Design a protein around this ligand. Structure first.
Ligand SMILES: [Zn+2]
Ligand SMILES: [Zn+2]
Ligand SMILES: [Zn+2]
Ligand SMILES: [Zn+2]
Ligand SMILES: [Zn+2]
Ligand SMILES: [Zn+2]
Ligand SMILES: [Zn+2]
Ligand SMILES: [Zn+2]
Ligand SMILES: [Zn+2]
Lengths: 8, 117
């Protein structure tokens, strides 16, 4: 259920 | 602020998920993002984020603005315990300062520059 965010 | 995520999941279930995700990904932090009550702003499709500790608040703003499909002139503000965080702070610093006892960080968003107005 996690939206994975990354460094740009 | 009442967060829907907290009303829908008992504290012990959130706390166990927060402990597990923090142990599994020590360089990420779990974040819940919900719209402030009576804000006049578009909805956010997802509320549960797993964020790099080194991502800045400003970088998170940019991503959340895009998820809401805001125009440039549409304002967006984050509140953590009614305070607007600095855009140069990291999400890890914000988490260390303000995460709750379930190991989640809770952010409210609004179109308005003051919470509850
Ligand atoms: Zn629900
Ligand atoms: Zn649920
Ligand atoms: Zn690092
Ligand atoms: Zn869009
Ligand atoms: Zn800060
Ligand atoms: Zn702070
Ligand atoms: Zn802690
Ligand atoms: Zn702080
Ligand atoms: Zn307590």
């Amino acid at each position: 259920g996690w939206l994975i965010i990354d460094l740009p | 602020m009442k967060f829907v995520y907290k009303e829908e999941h008992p504290f012990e279930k959130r706390r166990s998920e927060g402990e597990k995700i923090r142990k599994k990904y020590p360089d990420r932090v779990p974040v819940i993002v919900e719209k402030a009550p009576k804000a006049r702003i578009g909805d956010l499709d997802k509320k549960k984020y797993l964020v790099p500790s080194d991502l800045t608040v400003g970088q998170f703003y940019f991503l959340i603005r895009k998820r809401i499909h805001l125009r440039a002139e549409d304002a967006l503000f984050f509140f953590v315990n009614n305070v607007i965080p600095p855009t140069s702070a990291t999400m890890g610093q914000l988490y260390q300062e303000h995460h709750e006892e379930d190991f989640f960080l809770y952010i409210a968003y609004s179109d308005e520059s003051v919470y509850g107005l």
